[PDB]
Write an enzyme that holds these catalytic residues in place. Structure first.
Site, PDB file in Angstrom:
ATOM      1  N   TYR A  97       0.586  -1.236  -0.148  1.00  0.00           N
ATOM      2  CA  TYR A  97       0.123   0.087  -0.321  1.00  0.00           C
ATOM      3  C   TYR A  97       1.160   1.145   0.216  1.00  0.00           C
ATOM      4  O   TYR A  97       2.297   1.101  -0.249  1.00  0.00           O
ATOM      5  CB  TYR A  97      -1.124  -0.329   1.822  1.00  0.00           C
ATOM      6  CG  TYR A  97      -2.711   0.673   1.271  1.00  0.00           C
ATOM      7  CD1 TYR A  97      -3.102   0.436  -0.293  1.00  0.00           C
ATOM      8  CD2 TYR A  97      -2.640   1.939   1.414  1.00  0.00           C
ATOM      9  CE1 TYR A  97      -4.223   1.540  -0.510  1.00  0.00           C
ATOM     10  CE2 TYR A  97      -3.531   2.509   0.834  1.00  0.00           C
ATOM     11  CZ  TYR A  97      -4.258   2.628   0.176  1.00  0.00           C
ATOM     12  OH  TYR A  97      -5.415   3.235  -0.306  1.00  0.00           O
ATOM     13  N   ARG A 150      -7.814  11.339  -7.699  1.00  0.00           N
ATOM     14  CA  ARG A 150      -6.990  12.182  -6.689  1.00  0.00           C
ATOM     15  C   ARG A 150      -6.399  10.931  -6.002  1.00  0.00           C
ATOM     16  O   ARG A 150      -6.254  10.103  -4.610  1.00  0.00           O
ATOM     17  CB  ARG A 150      -7.950  12.914  -5.742  1.00  0.00           C
ATOM     18  CG  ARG A 150      -6.780  13.590  -4.637  1.00  0.00           C
ATOM     19  CD  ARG A 150      -8.080  14.024  -3.558  1.00  0.00           C
ATOM     20  NE  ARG A 150      -6.887  15.580  -3.651  1.00  0.00           N
ATOM     21  CZ  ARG A 150      -7.004  15.118  -2.137  1.00  0.00           C
ATOM     22  NH1 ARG A 150      -7.742  14.866  -1.282  1.00  0.00           N
ATOM     23  NH2 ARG A 150      -6.531  16.379  -1.435  1.00  0.00           N
ATOM     24  N   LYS A 168      -5.794  -1.816  -0.952  1.00  0.00           N
ATOM     25  CA  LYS A 168      -6.771  -1.781   0.085  1.00  0.00           C
ATOM     26  C   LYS A 168      -7.550  -2.726   0.414  1.00  0.00           C
ATOM     27  O   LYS A 168      -7.370  -2.842   1.647  1.00  0.00           O
ATOM     28  CB  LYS A 168      -7.884  -0.699  -0.279  1.00  0.00           C
ATOM     29  CG  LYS A 168      -8.185   0.007   0.671  1.00  0.00           C
ATOM     30  CD  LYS A 168      -7.416   0.943   1.382  1.00  0.00           C
ATOM     31  CE  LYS A 168      -8.392   1.470   2.303  1.00  0.00           C
ATOM     32  NZ  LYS A 168      -7.466   3.025   3.293  1.00  0.00           N
ATOM     33  N   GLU A 239     -12.870   5.457  -2.366  1.00  0.00           N
ATOM     34  CA  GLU A 239     -11.626   5.861  -2.355  1.00  0.00           C
ATOM     35  C   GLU A 239     -10.721   6.273  -3.214  1.00  0.00           C
ATOM     36  O   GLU A 239     -10.917   6.157  -4.673  1.00  0.00           O
ATOM     37  CB  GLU A 239     -10.379   4.956  -1.548  1.00  0.00           C
ATOM     38  CG  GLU A 239      -9.158   4.862  -1.502  1.00  0.00           C
ATOM     39  CD  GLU A 239      -8.737   5.129  -0.681  1.00  0.00           C
ATOM     40  OE1 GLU A 239      -9.078   4.608   0.544  1.00  0.00           O
ATOM     41  OE2 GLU A 239      -7.883   5.397   0.275  1.00  0.00           O
ATOM     42  N   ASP A 240     -10.164   7.905  -3.024  1.00  0.00           N
ATOM     43  CA  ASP A 240     -10.003   9.061  -3.429  1.00  0.00           C
ATOM     44  C   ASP A 240      -9.686   9.185  -5.224  1.00  0.00           C
ATOM     45  O   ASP A 240      -9.756   9.614  -6.447  1.00  0.00           O
ATOM     46  CB  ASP A 240      -7.805   7.839  -4.177  1.00  0.00           C
ATOM     47  CG  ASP A 240      -7.601   7.895  -3.162  1.00  0.00           C
ATOM     48  OD1 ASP A 240      -7.255   8.419  -2.467  1.00  0.00           O
ATOM     49  OD2 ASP A 240      -6.049   6.822  -3.703  1.00  0.00           O
ATOM     50  N   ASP A 262     -13.310   5.449   3.200  1.00  0.00           N
ATOM     51  CA  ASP A 262     -11.906   6.323   4.088  1.00  0.00           C
ATOM     52  C   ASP A 262     -11.029   7.699   4.110  1.00  0.00           C
ATOM     53  O   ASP A 262     -10.588   7.691   5.201  1.00  0.00           O
ATOM     54  CB  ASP A 262     -11.272   5.156   3.752  1.00  0.00           C
ATOM     55  CG  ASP A 262     -10.076   4.754   5.570  1.00  0.00           C
ATOM     56  OD1 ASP A 262     -11.052   4.545   5.809  1.00  0.00           O
ATOM     57  OD2 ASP A 262      -8.340   4.769   4.962  1.00  0.00           O
ATOM     58  N   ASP A 263     -11.647   8.328   3.097  1.00  0.00           N
ATOM     59  CA  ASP A 263     -10.087   9.450   3.149  1.00  0.00           C
ATOM     60  C   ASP A 263     -11.244  10.543   4.177  1.00  0.00           C
ATOM     61  O   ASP A 263     -10.054  10.795   4.437  1.00  0.00           O
ATOM     62  CB  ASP A 263     -10.066   9.991   1.786  1.00  0.00           C
ATOM     63  CG  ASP A 263      -9.301   9.023   0.443  1.00  0.00           C
ATOM     64  OD1 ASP A 263      -8.227   8.425   0.799  1.00  0.00           O
ATOM     65  OD2 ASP A 263     -10.019   7.831  -0.293  1.00  0.00           O
ATOM     66  N   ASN A 411       0.466  15.476   4.358  1.00  0.00           N
ATOM     67  CA  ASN A 411       1.244  13.673   3.970  1.00  0.00           C
ATOM     68  C   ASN A 411       1.781  14.724   2.747  1.00  0.00           C
ATOM     69  O   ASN A 411       0.709  15.642   1.817  1.00  0.00           O
ATOM     70  CB  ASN A 411       0.121  12.623   3.549  1.00  0.00           C
ATOM     71  CG  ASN A 411      -0.500  11.879   4.587  1.00  0.00           C
ATOM     72  OD1 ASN A 411       0.150  11.132   5.243  1.00  0.00           O
ATOM     73  ND2 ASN A 411      -1.530  12.208   4.469  1.00  0.00           N
TER      74      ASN A 411
END
Length: 557
Positions: A97, A150, A168, A239-240, A262-263, A411
């Site tokens: 990951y 993203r 994931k 996700e993303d 999750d983000d 990050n």
């Protein structure tokens, strides 16, 4: 555990990665499934296979090569892959990951070997049922889906987003015990605005700019409806996605299908969990502490909102809780009279009447001037601008607060408002530090200070295991808060009085199982899962927790 009944045989079986056992097929299985002579004679155990695999893994010299090797094993013997990962979790998690998976996504079209996962492009938008019908799994319980817009500080990577769900889901399995027979990675290919990919002759995705907003929301709705028809109880994790899409999709669908992002939600939860535990280790509790955020975007405000819900749960009124939190964007501070604020930031604006106390005045009140006038216990960075936690800004904070909690969450490591090495210096080893990105344990005066990372893998796998063990039909804010609170109970710094704020990865399965219990209990209490005894729920958690061991097989027609 009973036998599994399986139709495949011969080389087909040896090539079916979920079911293949390679050298561990027994003599009897080799006879019944027509494998005699197709393998070396030796019968080995999974643990002997995982040991050869580890020796192979060690001969690779870069992260990306280790990543390719792991995907190659995953695509040969899924149980072996998980066994090997379980034996070396700390080493491999960052290869499976983040951050290595990011590189894999950038280069998807150049490193491509074979297909894993389901791809749904714009051109397939009227045949999503047919596509889902092509998944051979008898049951799917967790889907991770991305449109690749993203990716973790890399932007739009088009269809190369696929590596994110795949990585994931490996974490759901390795951390939360979700069987790899029940997971499904999905990429939605609706184009890409990355001109370098559109211009890459090797690009394997739809060679077209991203479709329009109306086109987009109709397409995603066909996808959600198709997923619901086939797997009504599935857990779907987004996700993303782009910021403009992530929140609206979550709001639109979180009550239509069991789902979370999750983000947005996982990041808030792990951070709140960390804050709970940190505050208890500094003495007292999060409700007592004053808090300043550098970064007042959607992400900063979402984390702030969850802290405020939690401090209410600790005794405060909403008014009191919101008063203890101050949000800073580019301009100095969010307040009354600030023009052109979008709804979510309005909820967090400070009222100038409470600021009649302040020594400075202006339309714009600097961060150093906010830190000055609040005297916080906790400073959090989410903006992504480097060095903003200047030596003056840190000392001014340590100038009133004895045991500072500082969390550069930005990050990747390059964008942190201060490094761990810096702030531990500037506080003489008194600070409590947790980061968004991983750092190595800091050295200072012959003393070593491990730096905890707010890793989302502490939260989502438990969430998934809780959902599945309880049969929860949706994921409520309260279920997410129970995950944060449970996570804090496993803080080594609080438990043993020394260590990191968050637990070690050696314990991630233990944590996930405890989280699952809390999340499941909450769901039952809220009426989104059927009520059972606590003992029954615990037993369901245990019966749903997949470990990397082979099943016995019997052949059917």
């Amino acid at each position: 555990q009973r036998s599994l009944y399986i139709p495949y045989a011969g080389p087909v079986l040896l090539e079916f990665p979920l079911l293949n056992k390679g050298s561990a097929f027994s003599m009897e299985e080799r006879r019944n499934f027509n494998l005699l002579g197709l393998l070396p004679e030796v019968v080995e155990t999974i643990e002997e296979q995982a040991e050869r695999a580890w020796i192979q893994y060690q001969g690779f010299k870069t992260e990306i090569d280790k990543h390719i090797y792991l995907r190659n094993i995953q695509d040969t013997n899924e149980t072996l892959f998980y066994r090997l990962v379980n034996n070396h979790l700390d080493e491999m998690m960052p290869v499976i990951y983040t951050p290595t998976v990011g590189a894999a996504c950038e280069r998807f079209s150049e490193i491509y070997r074979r297909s894993r996962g389901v791809f749904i492009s714009y051109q397939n938008r009227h045949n999503m049922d047919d596509i889902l019908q092509n998944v051979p799994n008898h049951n799917i319980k967790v889907i991770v889906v991305t449109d690749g817009e993203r990716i973790l500080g890399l932007g739009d990577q088009g269809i190369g987003g696929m590596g994110i769900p795949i990585g994931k889901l490996s974490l759901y399995t390795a951390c939360g015990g979700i069987s790899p027979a029940y997971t499904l990675p999905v990429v939605l290919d609706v184009g890409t605005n990355n001109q370098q990919l559109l211009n890459d002759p090797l690009y394997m995705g739809w060679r077209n700019p991203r479709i329009t907003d109306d086109e987009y929301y109709e397409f995603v709705d066909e996808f959600i409806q198709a997923v619901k028809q086939r797997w009504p109880d599935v857990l779907l994790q987004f996700e993303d996605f782009a910021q403009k899409n992530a929140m609206p999709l979550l709001n639109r669908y979180r009550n239509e299908i069991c789902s979370f992002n999750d983000d947005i939600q996982g990041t808030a939860a792990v951070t709140v969990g960390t804050l709970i535990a940190a505050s208890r280790a500094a003495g007292g509790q999060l409700s007592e502490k004053k808090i300043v955020f550098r970064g007042a975007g959607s992400a900063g405000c979402g984390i702030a909102e969850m802290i405020i819900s939690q401090t209410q749960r600790e005794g405060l009124s909403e008014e009191a809780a919101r008063q203890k939190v101050f949000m800073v964007d580019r301009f100095g501070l969010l307040t009354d009279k600030m023009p052109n604020l979008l709804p979510f930031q309005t909820k967090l604006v400070q009222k100038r009447e409470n600021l009649s106390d302040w020594d400075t005045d202006s339309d714009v009140l600097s961060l150093l001037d906010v830190v000055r006038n609040v005297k916080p216990d906790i400073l959090i960075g989410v903006s992504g601008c480097t060095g903003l936690f200047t030596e003056e800004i840190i000392r001014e904070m340590h100038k009133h607060c004895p045991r500072p909690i500082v969390m550069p969450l930005s990050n990747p490591t390059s964008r942190v408002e201060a490094t761990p090495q810096d702030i531990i210096a500037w506080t003489e080893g008194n600070a409590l530090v947790a980061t968004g990105s991983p750092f190595n344990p800091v050295v200072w005066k012959d003393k070593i200070y491990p730096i905890a990372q707010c890793n989302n893998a502490f939260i989502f796998p438990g969430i998934g295991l809780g959902v599945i063990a309880s049969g929860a039909s949706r994921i409520t804010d309260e279920m997410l808060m129970s995950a944060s609170e449970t996570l804090a109970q496993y803080s080594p710094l609080v438990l043993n009085g020394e260590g990191m704020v968050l637990p070690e990865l050696k314990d991630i399965q233990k944590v996930s199982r405890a989280i699952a219990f809390a999340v499941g209990k909450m769901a039952q209490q809220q009426g989104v899962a059927v009520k059972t005894s606590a003992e029954a729920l615990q037993q369901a958690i245990d019966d749903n927790f997949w470990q990397a061991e082979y099943r016995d097989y019997r052949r059917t027609s």
